[PDB]
Amino acid sequence: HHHHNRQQIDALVKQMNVDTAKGPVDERIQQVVVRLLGDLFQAIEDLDIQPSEVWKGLEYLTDAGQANELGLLAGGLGLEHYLDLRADEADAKAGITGGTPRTIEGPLYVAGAPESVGFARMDDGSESDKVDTLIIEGTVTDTEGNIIEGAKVEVWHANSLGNYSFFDKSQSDFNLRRTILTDVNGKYVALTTMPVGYGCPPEGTTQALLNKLGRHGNRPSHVHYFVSAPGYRKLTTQFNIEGDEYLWDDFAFATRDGLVATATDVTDEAEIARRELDKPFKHITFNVELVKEAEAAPSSEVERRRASA
Amino acid sequence: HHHHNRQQIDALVKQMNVDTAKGPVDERIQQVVVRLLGDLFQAIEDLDIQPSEVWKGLEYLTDAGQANELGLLAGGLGLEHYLDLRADEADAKAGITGGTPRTIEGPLYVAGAPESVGFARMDDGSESDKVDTLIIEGTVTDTEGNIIEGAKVEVWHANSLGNYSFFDKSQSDFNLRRTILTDVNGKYVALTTMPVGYGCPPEGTTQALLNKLGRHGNRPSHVHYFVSAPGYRKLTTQFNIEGDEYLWDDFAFATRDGLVATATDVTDEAEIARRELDKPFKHITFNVELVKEAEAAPSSEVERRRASA
Ligand SMILES: CCCCCCCC/C=C/CCCCCCCC(=O)O[C@H](COC(=O)CCCCCCCCCCCCCCC)COP(=O)([O-])O[C@@H]1[C@H](O)[C@H](O)[C@@H](O)[C@H](O)[C@H]1O
Ligand SMILES: CCCCCCCC/C=C/CCCCCCCC(=O)O[C@H](COC(=O)CCCCCCCCCCCCCCC)COP(=O)([O-])O[C@@H]1[C@H](O)[C@H](O)[C@@H](O)[C@H](O)[C@H]1O
Numbered sequence: 001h002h003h004h005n006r007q008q009i010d011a012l013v014k015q016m017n018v019d020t021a022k023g024p025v026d027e028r029i030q031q032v033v034v035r036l037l038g039d040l041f042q043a044i045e046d047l048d049i050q051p052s053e054v055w056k057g058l059e060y061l062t063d064a065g066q067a068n069e070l071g072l073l074a075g076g077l078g079l080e081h082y083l084d085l086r087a088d089e090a091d092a093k094a095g096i097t098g099g100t101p102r103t104i105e106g107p108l109y110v111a112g113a114p115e116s117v118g119f120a121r122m123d124d125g126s127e128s129d130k131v132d133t134l135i136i137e138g139t140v141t142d143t144e145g146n147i148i149e150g151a152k153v154e155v156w157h158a159n160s161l162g163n164y165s166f167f168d169k170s171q172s173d174f175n176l177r178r179t180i181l182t183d184v185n186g187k188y189v190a191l192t193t194m195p196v197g198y199g200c201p202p203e204g205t206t207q208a209l210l211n212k213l214g215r216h217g218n219r220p221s222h223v224h225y226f227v228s229a230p231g232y233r234k235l236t237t238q239f240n241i242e243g244d245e246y247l248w249d250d251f252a253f254a255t256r257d258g259l260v261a262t263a264t265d266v267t268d269e270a271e272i273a274r275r276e277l278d279k280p281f282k283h284i285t286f287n288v289e290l291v292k293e294a295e296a297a298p299s300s301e302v303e304r305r306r307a308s309a
Numbered sequence: 310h311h312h313h314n315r316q317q318i319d320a321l322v323k324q325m326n327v328d329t330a331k332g333p334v335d336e337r338i339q340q341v342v343v344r345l346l347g348d349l350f351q352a353i354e355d356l357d358i359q360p361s362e363v364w365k366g367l368e369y370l371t372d373a374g375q376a377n378e379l380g381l382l383a384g385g386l387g388l389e390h391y392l393d394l395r396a397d398e399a400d401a402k403a404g405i406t407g408g409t410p411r412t413i414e415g416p417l418y419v420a421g422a423p424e425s426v427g428f429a430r431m432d433d434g435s436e437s438d439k440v441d442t443l444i445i446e447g448t449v450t451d452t453e454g455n456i457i458e459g460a461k462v463e464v465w466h467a468n469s470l471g472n473y474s475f476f477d478k479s480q481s482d483f484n485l486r487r488t489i490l491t492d493v494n495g496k497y498v499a500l501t502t503m504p505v506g507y508g509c510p511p512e513g514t515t516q517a518l519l520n521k522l523g524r525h526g527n528r529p530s531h532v533h534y535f536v537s538a539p540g541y542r543k544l545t546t547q548f549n550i551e552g553d554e555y556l557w558d559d560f561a562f563a564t565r566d567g568l569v570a571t572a573t574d575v576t577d578e579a580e581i582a583r584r585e586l587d588k589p590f591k592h593i594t595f596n597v598e599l600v601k602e603a604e605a606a607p608s609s610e611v612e613r614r615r616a617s618a
């Protein structure tokens with residue numbers, strides 16, 4: 001079934017995609033296209049991939065893009081996590097150590113969330129009779145424990161049904177999405193609701209492929225973070241919550257040591273009063289340590305197309 | 310910049326996509342996914358592809374799918390032609406020789422076109438004052454020249470502006486698309502208009518990438534064919550027209566020896582009368598030779614998602 005060897009493949013790819021060039025070429029795009037096409041052709045030879053199979057793959061990719069699910073698929077196949085594995089190894093080779101660990105962004109960030117100093121309430125109260133109240137708090141410091149005032153703590157997470165605002169058009173705009181600037185003591189406090197883990201859209205393209213792979217499409221409960229500050233490396237991270245069925249079986253492979261938090265229960269009447277609440281709530285501490293930006297440091301910032309509102 | 314070797318990549322891909330499987334798996338889909346992901350990860354290592362670059366690639370693929378242009382991109386990068394190169398080599402190894410050569414289908418077939426016996430007029434006459442009339446005719450035979458009656462000759466082509474019906478919603482439904490069944494003499498005749506070659510949509514995703522590659526997105530003038538008959542191998546082919554600027558510079562690499570036709574000019578008053586026309590016209594002969602279906606023969610039919618109306 002081998003109709004072409006790699007030499008013959010490379011010659012064909014060059015004839016079609018390089019020899020045909022006239023005028024200015026983007027050299028990087030040319031390099032990447034030539035490599036990926038040659039690899040695709042060689043996989044077609046090695047696995048004897050039939051035209052009907054190739055068309056099914058392209059039809060799948062078309063459907064995935066129309067469903068806006070390619071970011072989700074990048075998470076599920078483990079490509080998004082792989083990019084973090086690479087970034088961690090690049091940082092190790094730079095001698096950059098310390099700092100809260102990174103993990104995946106996911107595909108559901110939205111720019112433009114309400115900003116406040118030191119404290120934000122993240123939810124609109126529309127689920128107050130059906131989900132636990134959660135307070136999250138932490139201090140943002142450098143690697144030696146010195147507080148950072150004015151650090152930008154961006155948080156987003158799912159509602160009691162595992163759905164995110166903007167994508168779920170039934171929620172109010174920016175529900176469960178906030179930017180909190182750390183106060184004079186380096187502190188942030190978020191008053192919110194307990195996120196639940198969630199699956200992929202069950203009739204969607206990502207779950208369709210996971211089904212063929214015998215795989216589930218679930219993530220454990222988590223809260224996403226961007227943390228940034230002048231003079232420090234930007235951090236993309238999350239915490240997961242101890243106790244979740246899928247904690248160490250995340251379909252997007254994002255859970256890490258250092259990023260698992262325990263939700264404590266507060267039933268004490270005095271403490272409840274102090275928080276201006278009326279019922280028991282859950283409490284999570286999540287401190288963040290940022291690494292100073294050095295001339296030698298690889299960038300920790302990632303350009304990516306992101307929703308805005 | 311090499312953070313992982315292929316052994317480490319393969320182990321990671323297995324951990325994420327295979328070890329996580331529970332219950333029935335589609336073994337072929339699993340095999341192909343594992344191979345393509347491992348290859349993608351290795352290309353990322355070898356070329357030190359940055360997260361921002363990966364996200365740009367996925368955003369491009371998303372945009373391409375939303376624009377319904379991935380079939381067009383398959384043609385332009387030469388993947389569609391490569392599939393034919395493979396099919397030709399498989400046929401050679403089977404000892405299948407003879408027959409009109411195959412070439413690419415393109416992405417613009419529509420099922421459901423008007424059917425008639427022996428003769429069809431393909432155009433609605435809406436361009437009669439701005440484009441040349443073309444008569445196409447041919448005989449469909451086996452490899453020894455014996456006529457085949459009742460062969461299904463499916464033809465589609467572009468209008469005077471290089472646009473195809475169904476996709477160009479300004480044209481009448483099925484304009485320049487017909488199915489003609491060969492008559493008792495194995496003959497088909499199509500009365501139509503001269504197609505013009507065309508480019509990719511200039512603001513679309515395919516041309517955007519071709520621009521980065523320094524490449525044009527043009528095809529020479531051509532008419533597409535499916536030819537099928539009981540007992541014979543289905544044929545996907547075209548003819549191109551001698552004289553076209555892009556005849557041997559097709560951005561989708563479809564031109565072949567054996568598939569170039571010369572448009573003859575008919576100015577003779579007697580012949581014009583015979584055809585029931587009033588002006589000179591162009592004439593193309595395109596005969597088709599079909600190969601008998603043998604038990605040993607690979608399939609020449611391709612399952613593919615196709616428009617219908
Ligand atoms: C670049 C080009 C390379 C790829 C292109 C070339 C590679 C060729 C790939 C060949 C794959 C083998 C095909 C085997 C035959 C298919 C059988 C089948 O059951 O049909 C369908 C399966 O088709 C597939 O999903 C296979 C394609 C997956 C390839 C992409 C893997 C990406 C890997 C690496 C890239 C990095 C990944 C990047 C990270 C994002 C089942 O139907 P469906 O549930 O999948 O979808 C269903 C469905 O079909 C329903 O009918 C519909 O109603 C519903 O909505 C839909 O969900
Ligand atoms: C499976 C996953 C693998 C890939 C995923 C992983 C691989 C990662 C790929 C990395 C590529 C290198 C990126 C370099 C930096 C980009 C710079 C730039 O100028 O930005 C843009 C270029 O971005 C690209 O097109 C690069 C991605 C191409 C990769 C796909 C090749 C497929 C090969 C093989 C697969 C078989 C092919 C299959 C056959 C079909 C220029 O803008 P634009 O004109 O391209 O689009 C423009 C634009 O950006 C405008 O802003 C917009 O308005 C307009 O509409 C749009 O058209």
Ligand SMILES: [Fe+3]
Nearest residue numbers: 106108222224
């Ligand atoms: Fe999330």
Ligand SMILES: [Fe+3]
Nearest residue numbers: 415417531533
């Ligand atoms: Fe065409």
